[PDB]
């Protein structure tokens, strides 16, 4: 809103009021506006709901990843904690029970603050933290990244929309109290207890069949929730702010609208089914009332009882000014030198997280990918990967190998890929709109090569200190279909290094179809950047196993995995015997 002001004045035909100036300074920001990414995001192949993937025609898994790097910069604990909160709700809005969370951390040292953040929150809501990243390097020192990925399971005959379908409907706001939360007006503590009461409250409203549409209240709050609920429906809404559950009754109308208070949710239902929805909230210790009315005219009316404060067209809010793309075309696969990333033990970080709650975790973290189940059905496998060390030398091939090496880790357990979830953590997009394109086109092409679509995404730009940008890191989140019985559990066997030391895309699909011919055969595969990490040897010791091998030194960009079978692997790719895994 430093230059986008002049573009707003010509669409309104006058000067904006104090209510409108604060509304569009948050709605047309780079967080919930997407000005430098909206046009690239349409070019990427998607999967009529954005965030859900069909698994068994009976069930469907809902997953998304958000980036809370900015509130984690000022305060680590209450930042990462706040992060798990806003992503858990974006999954619950689809009517799914949050079944798995991931934490993609990128710091200078294992900051006890960010770690304890995801812990005290994730464990308090009974959602297992079944894995995550821990890329430690002094390049992130003054700019840490925290990408939390929440996942949930849901029946297809109980799925919830994310838009208001017809007029004559009402939007109900419930959850925690709505106060003054938006080094002063930006720091807030999360209430993981209210979040659990919000989950069990919402999921009873779903089974009661009273949810016809819903949206989370994270960034922007009541404004960015009720406006985006009628913007994807092409309809409108009349918002009464006197009906919003206030904590401090002495709040001015604009503060009730722009309030970015947590633990709140938005539900679209009919006025006859609202008397039963508020009784479910009061039963779960939550506060709620009817705030908005869905009309036919595509306008957004905001008033406070009888007097008005703001009225602007609905589509002028959800659609931010789309910047122009600078299409990038691919260059030669460079010779990558090894960028030293401190090799740490992930056990010390996840043994602080409840990764077994729900009793649905089949494969606990340590050996990359994590496999889950649905207690009856079938299961799903999620992995989180980002080749940050390669992305530094090449903004394209580094980011492309990240999407491919992700699919490599998903086939290692025995799961056939279904979807991807992106998260762009670029530096300044105006000083270098060239590097952002090399990344977005690296994710577009890598999704056409593997034929794996993108369900949902995110982008947190402007990450700089001293003016110097952050290493372009794209975090991929895979999802795959698997049978919880046909999973690789570490047995005492001989270790084989399969694949080749060098990288060449021209024969990458030959490694994938080589891993597949080895998984349904009953072997344990391990795909990692450094082949075997400190983490792998420590998770092996917990299974009472010791590993002694001669790891063939590979180049940073490689196509190799370690296979632990009984007899010599029968595949059409280099198979060398490197050791054993006794006792």
């Amino acid at each position: 809103k430093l230059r986008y002001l002049n573009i707003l004045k010509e669409k309104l035909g006058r000067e904006p009021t104090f209510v409108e100036l604060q509304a569009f300074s948050v709605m047309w920001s780079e967080h919930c506006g997407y000005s430098h990414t909206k046009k690239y995001i349409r070019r990427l192949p998607k999967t009529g709901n954005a965030g859900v993937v069909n698994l068994d025609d009976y069930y469907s898994v809902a997953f998304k990843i958000e980036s809370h790097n900015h509130p984690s910069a000022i305060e680590p604990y209450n930042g990462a904690a706040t992060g798990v909160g806003g992503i858990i709700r974006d999954v619950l809005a689809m009517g799914a029970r949050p079944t798995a969370i991931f934490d993609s951390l990128h710091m200078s040292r294992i900051i006890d603050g960010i770690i304890e953040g995801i812990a005290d929150y994730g464990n308090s809501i009974g959602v297992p933290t079944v894995g995550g990243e821990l890329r430690i390097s002094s390049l992130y020192a003054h700019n840490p990244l925290v990408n939390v990925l929440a996942a949930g399971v849901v029946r297809n005959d109980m799925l919830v929309d994310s838009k208001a379908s017809r007029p004559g409907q009402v939007i109900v706001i419930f959850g925690g109290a709505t106060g003054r939360d938006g080094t002063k007006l930006s720091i807030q503590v999360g209430d993981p207890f209210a979040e659990k009461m919000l989950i069990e409250a919402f999921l009873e409203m779903v089974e009661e069949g009273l949810v016809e549409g819903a949206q989370d209240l994270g960034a922007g709050g009541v404004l960015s929730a009720t406006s985006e609920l009628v913007a994807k429906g092409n309809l409108g809404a009349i918002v009464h702010l006197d009906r919003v559950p206030l904590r401090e009754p002495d709040m001015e109308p604009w503060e009730i609208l722009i309030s970015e208070s947590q633990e709140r949710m938005a539900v679209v239902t009919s006025p006859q089914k609202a008397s039963r929805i508020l009784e479910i909230a009061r039963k779960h210790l939550l506060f709620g009332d009817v705030v908005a009315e869905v009309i036919e005219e595509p306008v957004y009316r905001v008033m406070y009882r009888n007097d008005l404060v703001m009225e602007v067209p609905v589509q002028l809010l959800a659609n931010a000014p789309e910047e122009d793309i600078v299409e990038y075309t691919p260059g030669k696969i460079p010779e990558f030198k090894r960028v030293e990333f401190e090799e740490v033990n992930a056990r010390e970080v996840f043994e602080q997280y409840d990764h077994m709650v729900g009793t649905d975790t089949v494969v606990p973290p340590g050996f990359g990918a994590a496999v889950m189940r649905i207690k009856r059905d079938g299961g799903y496998s999620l992995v989180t990967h980002s080749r940050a060390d390669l992305a530094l030398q090449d903004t394209y091939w580094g980011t492309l190998i990240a999407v491919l090496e992700s699919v490599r880790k998903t086939l290692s357990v025995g799961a056939e890929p279904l979807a991807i979830t992106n998260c762009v953590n670029y530096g300044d997009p105006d000083v270098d709109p060239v590097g952002l394109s090399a990344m977005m086109t690296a994710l577009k092409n890598a999704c056409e090569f593997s034929g794996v679509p993108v369900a949902s995404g995110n982008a947190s730009l402007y990450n700089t200190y001293q003016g110097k940008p952050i290493p372009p890191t794209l975090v991929v989140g895979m999802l795959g279909k698997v049978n919880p019985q046909k999973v690789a559990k570490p047995k005492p066997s001989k270790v084989f290094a399969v694949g080749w030391n060098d990288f060449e895309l021209e024969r990458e699909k030959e490694l994938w179809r080589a891993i597949r011919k080895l998984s349904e055969e009953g072997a344990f595969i391990l795909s990692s950047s450094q082949l075997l990490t400190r983490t792998h040897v420590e998770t092996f010791r917990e299974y009472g196993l010791k590993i002694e091998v001669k790891l063939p030194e590979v180049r940073p960009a490689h196509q190799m995995v370690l296979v632990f079978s009984e007899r010599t692997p029968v595949v059409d790719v280099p198979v060398k015997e490197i050791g054993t895994l006794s006792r």
């Binding site: 000022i74 305060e75 209450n78 106060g179 003054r180 080094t183 002063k184 720091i187 807030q188 503590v189 999360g190 209430d191 207890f193 209210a194 904590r247």
Partner: protein, 82 residues
């Protein structure tokens, strides 16, 4: 030589809402029915210092706060002698 007993009373700042203390405030007034308006729940750290004067002792406690015990962003504090 010499001893100096202290007690730190940490708390979340005035503007920051503490749900921990607000859930207990709501319990003591509705479930236990005791007329109690407006609780805060923080940390109280007792520590013995070995310094020189009374002046040198107080500034020791102050460095241990700004560097570890009291988070300068959301926490506020006030120390008293023992």
């Amino acid at each position: 030589m010499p001893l100096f007993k202290f007690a730190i009373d940490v708390q979340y700042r005035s503007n920051v809402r503490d749900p921990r203390g607000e859930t207990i405030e709501r319990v003591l007034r509705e479930e236990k029915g005791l007329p109690v308006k407006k609780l805060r729940l923080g940390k109280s750290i007792h520590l013995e210092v070995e310094a020189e004067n009374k002046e040198k002792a107080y500034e020791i406690v102050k460095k241990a706060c700004e560097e570890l015990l009291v988070n300068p962003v959301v926490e506020e504090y006030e120390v008293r002698e023992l």
